[PDB]
Subunit: 103 residues, 5 copies
Amino acid sequence: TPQNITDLCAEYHNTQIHTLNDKIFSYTESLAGKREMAIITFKNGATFQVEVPGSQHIDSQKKAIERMKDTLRIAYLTEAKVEKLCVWNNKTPHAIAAISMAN
Amino acid sequence: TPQNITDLCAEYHNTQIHTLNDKIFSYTESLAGKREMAIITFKNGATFQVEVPGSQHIDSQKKAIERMKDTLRIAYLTEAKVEKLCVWNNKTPHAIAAISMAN
Amino acid sequence: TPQNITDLCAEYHNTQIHTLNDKIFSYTESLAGKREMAIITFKNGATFQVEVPGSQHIDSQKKAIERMKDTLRIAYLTEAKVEKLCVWNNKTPHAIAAISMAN
Amino acid sequence: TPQNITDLCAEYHNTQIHTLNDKIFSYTESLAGKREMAIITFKNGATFQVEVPGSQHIDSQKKAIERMKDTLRIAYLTEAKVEKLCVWNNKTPHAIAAISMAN
Amino acid sequence: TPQNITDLCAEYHNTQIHTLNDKIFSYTESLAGKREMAIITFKNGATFQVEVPGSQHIDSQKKAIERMKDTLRIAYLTEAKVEKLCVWNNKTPHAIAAISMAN
């Protein structure tokens, strides 16, 4: 069981770590069919998505996808600093697998 | 997969972007039968709804609809600046498909 | 489709609008069986409930009843000004159908 | 239908009202099997639980049990003043049935 | 039924109490399949996880695991002081069984 976001991100090829140490610049949320997703950006220009839940996601993952969108919204609205994002780099925007918040 | 609300909105028919760059002026919600909905207004008069859930709303739209109502409520209470809305404009009040917030 | 809380309230029999323009004075919540409800009051002594879910409600209302209790709790804790309430006046305490918040 | 927590408490056997008029000193929460519960304390020593969901609860209470734990958690973090608690006194710690918060 | 986290912790095997009396330093969350988990750390270097739900967890534990991650997130964002953690010391990181917060 990984002890931090780096070790978890290492479990996957084609994921990569981004260190932002910054608050989210914008938060975008959609309920449109087949675009039930979230998109965040940072002032450095970086853009990331939470994937649309699909048949490729087991049910436990779909539930965690909903959690992640909860986390990003309240992080945005509290101006909480994001430390790192672990993101799949084979999707555009890169897709969030894990997030850390610290200080 | 789009990277922002404007490109996401261009992927559908019967949608348009509204640019507000303002906080929500009023939040209204109802539990009354057949009107289980939320309504928001802006000081310029613009009025929008989150639609009552129905049979046109498909799989994971059901969760996204509830999340949107959560988001509008917490956005209203935090006075978060709303940047743009993607809305379905074949309904009145315009039905929100997506929202973007930027400081 | 109604555009605001007053038009919405007009669509139902035995309802009326209370214009409070004030924060919630008390929030009360119960989990006891058959009394799973919420009660709020205002400075002026006005008392309102969120009814227990029962046979008078249709399936579409079930999530909305839970949302409304969420809304009243966070409204109370933020000291948010509630503008109007649409209530069924054939219940005691009057039963909330819709809420608007502005300011 | 009762109009306040005191009237609601009197509708049940083995209940009593505690008047605290104080914020919550401590919030404890457990996910261990058979102890999925919450325990709160006040500064005077009073200790109360939200019971583990079991057969003694009707289905309607399950949702309300989860809500009560949500409410105690956020009440604690916001240092909200708890007015009164309705509890079952045939359980140790006394088990919460209803809570009133008042400004 | 135990009256505090220390007594609750003693009911289980392979558990131990950690007394932190500090806010959470970092909150980490993953949505990767079969890694749906949360990790928190404190400035004393202690690292703890909320376990991935599965097998070891009955029905009521699943709900409680999700609640626990909700609680740690909002505790982190509010910088609430956590008093103690009851953890299974037969997992790495030690897995959280219960949390106490005291203000």
